[PDB]
Amino acid sequence: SKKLKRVGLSQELCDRLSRHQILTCQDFLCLSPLELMKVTGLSYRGVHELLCMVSRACAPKMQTAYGIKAQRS
Amino acid sequence: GVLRVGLCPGLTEEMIQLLRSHRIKTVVDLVSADLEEVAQKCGLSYKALVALRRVLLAQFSAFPVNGADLYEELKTSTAILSTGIGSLDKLLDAGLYTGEVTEIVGGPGSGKTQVCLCMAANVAHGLQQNVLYVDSNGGLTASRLLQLLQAKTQDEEEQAEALRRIQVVHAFDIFQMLDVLQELRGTVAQQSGTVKVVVVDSVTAVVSPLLGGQQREGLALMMQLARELKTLARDLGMAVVVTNHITRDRDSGRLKPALGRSWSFVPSTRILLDTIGGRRMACLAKSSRQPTGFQEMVDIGTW
Amino acid sequence: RSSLKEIEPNLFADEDVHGDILEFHGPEGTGKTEMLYHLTARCILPKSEGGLEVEVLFIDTDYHFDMLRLVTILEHRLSQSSEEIIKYCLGRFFLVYCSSSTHLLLTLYSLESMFCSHPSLCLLILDSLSAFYWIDRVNGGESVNLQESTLRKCSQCLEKLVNDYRLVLFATTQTIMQKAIDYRPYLCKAWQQLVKHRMFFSKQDSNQFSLVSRCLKSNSLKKHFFIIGESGVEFC
Amino acid sequence: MQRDLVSFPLSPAVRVKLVSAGFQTAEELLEVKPSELSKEVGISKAEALETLQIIRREKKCTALELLEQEHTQGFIITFCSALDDILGGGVPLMKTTEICGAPGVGKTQLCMQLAVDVQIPECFGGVAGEAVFIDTEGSFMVDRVVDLATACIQHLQLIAEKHKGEEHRKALEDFTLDNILSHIYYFRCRDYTELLAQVYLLPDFLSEHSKVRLVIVDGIAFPFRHDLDDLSLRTRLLNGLAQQMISLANNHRLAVILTNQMTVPALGESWGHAATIRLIFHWDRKQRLATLYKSPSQKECTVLFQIKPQGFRD
Ligand SMILES: Nc1ncnc2c1ncn2[C@@H]1O[C@H](COP(=O)(O)OP(=O)(O)NP(=O)(O)O)[C@@H](O)[C@H]1O
Ligand SMILES: Nc1ncnc2c1ncn2[C@@H]1O[C@H](COP(=O)(O)OP(=O)(O)NP(=O)(O)O)[C@@H](O)[C@H]1O
Ligand SMILES: Nc1ncnc2c1ncn2[C@@H]1O[C@H](COP(=O)(O)OP(=O)(O)O)[C@@H](O)[C@H]1O
Ligand SMILES: [Mg+2]
Ligand SMILES: [Mg+2]
């Protein structure tokens, strides 16, 4: 859905991804953390920082079940 | 490694810069390169480099071990650690072997963790030797280890003492597992009874996410994990036991160990566990001392 | 020295001494290491038994040498097995453990001292040269030179070691990559040029093994069948 | 001891540069300064600082200690005596449990029941934790959980006076419906990417919410069996997700519930190794049966359970 330009990644990192045909959050997430260490450069726990950053743009919003009951009222 | 002060006595930093100036930065660079040419070029004494080459070789190159010395040493060093399963120790020629990476390949619910716990439980109690159970799938359950020990021994304290020898360390990524083995290897180097059995359950759990895609870094991490396991086994003389998943071949359509063909050369001994509820078949898929193909019944409830 | 056909007549049926480098290839359990033990046995056993009584150097880069297995093979091949004879036979066997390619490379340079002091050391084992392939390949990045830099230096050192002391290098490699006689070369071209006879180990599905040996100088293929028992390797 | 640089989680670009500069063991880089490392390797200051940091950074609890942890950290009861008995007392913490079954068997009913059962106070035998519900099929019905919560309160208050003691009744002063629902964290993951994204954000989520003692992924089948035709990718994602869940449960000391759909359970053969505990909910003559297909602590067995309006009962 969302592109990786709008996730929050840098131009250098996006360009390094664009060379490997990665432009969406789906493509970035489908790759394992290890294979992103060469596609995106960087290291483990640095790609995980990206993996948490890319996830933070395409993850559901937590809804407390009281809020769901409250919003259903 | 890299030529630096403290790598060898008499190696001053002043010449280390001089060696760098001629593209000699590593130990292998200094040993491989013709020292007579460098001695004239850098002004360093030829006798110094020759002495420097010998000390670097005497420090970083392994030394041949005579077979007679190794045979006598391994005679009183290698120990056939019983797995607690009499119907499997018969397959393993009286049990596990220290200094070897034993692999227990099987499907889900094939008893891979269960036999590993019995190996841990028997070594902890029967042989009074500490065990390092590196679990990656969460297979180890301390109630099961106590349950196995309760059958073997009815003493309240001896069950706790045997459990005290089993060190459970959780590692779920490859680097965590590599850290545990390296931390263990340093612990053994610096030494109370040390760790005699290392159980990894499972190697395929952490290595399989690495595999996939055009990247070969997963294979390197697998082989580095393989190298760490074999350094623990052969160098430190401990019976390293690993757990592997089963997979069906793409072409031949037969059961083979997971983690590709590269990992298939890693273990010295491999046990295949396949269901024939507690009865299992233990087939010696790979062995360095016994024919491959012999299979014996293994029942979980007897343990 | 001794002729290759004088080491194992079955594999080297033709006349094929003084600097031969041979490659063992095949999947796991196919008898690569067990063939080395048979080669080790026929060299370290006494001339009275039938062996060549020459020293053997084993570079166990794969950490898979089972000494008790070699003792098991040696005692079966001995007509009168004794603790003294098994000691003397293993007294001609030398084992080196190399945990990395650079460790292997530095070891090979240090071996130059031993061969100058061990003239009878004729047969050399390097099981397995493919142990550090993935470690070296990834550490080399995308540059092929960097990936094979350590292996190529080993191969040049090996060629120097073999051709200076008239050695026989039975270096073994593992079929770690899929098909292109299933053989996909993956080591450095420096190593490939040194191989004179590459023998492919295959397992027939039980205890019977097939060994296809090709002399790269003449490109002649011959199939050998051998069974692995308690005595080691017997050719059918 | 020398630790190879490949074994470290270094940047592959940096590791190749380190090897090309001759550095191949961790102990070589320890003596090197960060800025001087950049000069000798060519990596940036940040990468050199991160490279040395990774090497320098790189519990060993005995089984007796883990036995006390498993005893103190009680099992999440399923409100069914038969099911809890063949699980040691309920869903085990620090472990991954899989609920496989055909559609309509009650996989989500167990999950929604387990969400309430986590919030049972410790003095009542529960873990007094919170539940994270990573819903994928949209089967999480709040109204049904309210019935499950109210019935759980009624059951706990029935045991709160047979003992003739108010000491337990103190614990039940917060178990009201308000807290039960407010402690159920609901993540509606639609696609597998969104589900996979939430898994990566879960360790950070549970650091903030240390009270979470249950993570429910209901289910791991639907996202990966829709809008994903690549089986090679699927088995990589599930295998990678397998380690994320088990690491999450062990590090945060909670229980992970995964629900499959019978196809044998789906998601390939390698997925059978993912979950330490596997429960197969199937049918037999219009009576629900709970089969323990795989467990490292309990032998394979089948127990009878019924999904009454009161909840997941015997
Ligand atoms: N206490 C017990 N008594 C009898 N049988 C048991 C007991 N605990 C476990 N089992 C059996 O062990 C089986 C699973 O054993 P296990 O060792 O976990 O297999 P596994 O191959 O390790 N599965 P995995 O976690 O993927 O590796 C169960 O299905 C039971 O049949
Ligand atoms: N005492 C024995 N009797 C009969 N067969 C045996 C005996 N010992 C070993 N074998 C068989 O000999 C085969 C050859 O073993 P081995 O030489 O180690 O294989 P390999 O090619 O070296 N695999 P690898 O370790 O990766 O090099 C084994 O797979 C066993 O099936
Ligand atoms: N209030 C209720 N009364 C009776 N039966 C119910 C009630 N709620 C749910 N059930 C039963 O529980 C099952 C729920 O299965 P579930 O796991 O939630 O869906 P799926 O199996 O499709 O994932 C249904 O088959 C239904 O028969
Ligand atoms: Mg297991
Ligand atoms: Mg071998």
| Residue matched to tokens 């899929």 | C178
Nearest to C29 by CA among C155, C168, C205: C205
Q: In chain B, which residue ranges form alpha helices assigned H by DSSP?
A: 13-21, 27-32, 35-42, 46-60, 67-75, 86-89, 112-125, 142-152, 156-165, 174-190, 203-210, 217-230
Beta-carbon count within 10 A of D153 CB: 18
Report the alpha-carbon distance of residue C134 to residue D299 in Å, rounded: 41
- The answer to whether B182 and B190 have CB atoms below 8 angstroms apart is no
CATH value of B69-299 in 1.10.10.10, 3.40.50.800, 3.90.700.10, 3.40.50.300: 3.40.50.300
Q: Is A32 on the interface with B (CB under 8 A)?
A: yes
Q: Which residues does B85 contact at the CB level (< 8 Å), separation at least 6? A: B115, B118, B298, B302, B303
Report the alpha-carbon distance of residue A14 to residue B203 in Å, rounded: 34
CA dihedral A20, A22, A27, A33 (to 10 degrees): 60
Report the alpha-carbon distance of residue B13 to residue B2 in Å, rounded: 12
Beta strands D287-294 and D277-284 are antiparallel
Nearest to B287 by CA among B116, B89, B92: B92
Ligand 3 geometric centre to CA of D248 (Å): 28
- Length of chain D in residues, anyone? 314
Counting from 1 in the atom list of ligand 1, the atom nearest the Cα of B139 is 25
In terms of CA atoms, which chain D residue is nearest residue A51? D200
Nearest to B263 by CA among A9, D139, C28, D180: C28
- Length of chain B in residues, anyone? 303
Cis peptide before B202 (omega within 30 of 0): yes
For residue A16, CA distances in Å to A21, A22, A55 come to 9, 9, 19
Burial label for C179, CB within 10 Å (0-12, 13-18, 19+), is exposed
Work out whether the CA dihedral C127, C130, C135, C140 comes out positive or negative. Answer: positive
Report the alpha-carbon distance of residue B168 to residue B146 in Å, rounded: 14
DSSP string spanning D157-178? HHHHHHT--HHHHHHTTS-SHH
The HSE-up count of residue D174 (CA atoms within 13 Å, CB side) is 13
Work out whether the CA dihedral C78, C81, C85, C87 comes out positive or negative. Answer: positive
Q: Any idea where the domains of chain B sit in the sequence?
A: 69-299
Q: Please name every residue paired with B197 in a beta bridge, in sequence order, or none if there are none.
A: B131, B239
| Residue matched to tokens 């049926």 | C13
Q: Any idea where the domains of chain D sit in the sequence?
A: 63-313
CA D193 to chain centroid: 18
Tokens coding D229: 């035709």
CA dihedral C150, C156, C157, C163 (to 10 degrees): 160
CA dihedral B119, B125, B128, B129 (to 10 degrees): 30
Where would I find the beta strands (DSSP E) of D21-171? 61-62, 95-101, 130-135
Report the alpha-carbon distance of residue D100 to residue D219 in Å, rounded: 10
Does the distance separating the beta carbons of A59 and D198 come in below 8 Å? Answer: yes
Return the residue whose CA atom lies nearest to atom 24 of ligand 2: C28
Report the alpha-carbon distance of residue B174 to residue B186 in Å, rounded: 18
Nearest to D47 by CA among B108, A12, A27, B187: A12
Beta strands C20-26 and C197-203 are parallel
Specified resolution (Å): 2.3
Report the alpha-carbon distance of residue D70 to residue D90 in Å, rounded: 12
Report the alpha-carbon distance of residue C171 to residue C127 in Å, rounded: 6
Q: What residue type is assigned to position D207 of the chain?
A: S
Q: Any idea where the domains of chain A sit in the sequence?
A: 11-72
CA angle B57, B63, B68 (to 5 degrees): 165
Q: Which residues does C168 contact at the CB level (< 8 Å), separation at least 6? A: C4, C7, C19, C20, C21, C22, C122, C123, C124, C162
Report the alpha-carbon distance of residue C186 to residue C180 in Å, rounded: 11
Does the distance separating the beta carbons of D6 and B164 come in below 8 Å? Answer: no
Interruptions in chain A after residues (C–N over 2.5 Å): none
Report the alpha-carbon distance of residue B283 to residue B105 in Å, rounded: 10
Report the alpha-carbon distance of residue D230 to residue D234 in Å, rounded: 6
| Residue matched to tokens 């098909």 | C179
Nearest to D191 by CA among D157, D154, D150, D237: D237
Q: What residue type is assigned to position D306 of the chain?
A: Q
Beta-carbon count within 10 A of B143 CB: 18
Tokens coding D13: 């670009």
Nearest to B266 by CA among B225, B226, B231: B226
Does the distance separating the beta carbons of D19 and C139 come in below 8 Å? Answer: yes
CA B152 to chain centroid: 28
Angle subtended by helix axes D12-20 and D45-57, to nearest 10 = 90
Report the alpha-carbon distance of residue B247 to residue B255 in Å, rounded: 6
Domain D63-313 fold: Rossmann fold (3.40.50)
CATH value of A11-72 in 1.10.3470, 1.20.1180, 1.10.150, 2.30.30: 1.10.150
Report the alpha-carbon distance of residue C134 to residue C185 in Å, rounded: 14
Q: Which residues of A touch D205 (CB under 8 A)?
A: 62
- The helix or strand, by DSSP H or E, that contains position D303, with its residue range, turns out to be strand D302-304
DSSP string spanning B34-90? -HHHHHHHH---HHHHHHHHHHHHHHHS---EEHHHHHHHHHTT------S-HHHHT
Does the distance separating the beta carbons of C94 and B32 come in below 8 Å? Answer: no
- The answer to whether C221 and C200 have CB atoms below 8 angstroms apart is no
CA dihedral D247, D253, D259, D265 (to 10 degrees): 50
Longest dimension (CA), chain D: 76
Tokens coding D56: 């320098």
Burial label for C20, CB within 10 Å (0-12, 13-18, 19+), is buried
CA angle C183, C187, C190 (to 5 degrees): 120
Domains of chain C: 4-235 (3.40.50.300)
- The answer to whether B149 and B303 have CB atoms below 8 angstroms apart is no
Burial label for C184, CB within 10 Å (0-12, 13-18, 19+), is exposed
CA dihedral C209, C215, C219, C224 (to 10 degrees): -20
Give the residue, out of D217, D281, D307, with the most ligand 3 atoms within 8 A of its beta carbon, to mutate for a pocket test. D307
Q: Is D14 on the interface with A (CB under 8 A)?
A: yes
Work out whether the CA dihedral B148, B150, B153, B158 comes out positive or negative. Answer: positive
| Residue matched to tokens 């071949």 | B249
SS3 D130: strand
Integer distance in angstroms from the first to the last C-alpha of chain D? 57
For residues D244-267, b (16+ Cβ closer than 10 Å) or e, as one string? bbbbbbbebbbbbbbbbbeeebeb
DSSP string spanning chain C? ---HHHH-TTT--S----SEEEEEEE-TTSSHHHHHHHHHHHHHS-TTTTS---EEEEE-TTS---HHHHHHHHHHH-SS--HHHHHHHHHTEEEE---SHHHHHHHHHHHHHHHHH-TTEEEEE---TTTTHHHHHHHTTT-HHHHTHHHHHHHHHHHHHHHHHT-EEEEEEE--S---------S-HHHHTT-SEEEEEEE----EEEEEEEETTTTEEEEEEEEEETTEEEE-
Ligand with an atom nearest the CA of residue D108: 3
CA dihedral D295, D298, D302, D307 (to 10 degrees): -80
For residue B263, CA distances in Å to B273, B285, C65, C131, C204 come to 18, 14, 17, 10, 21
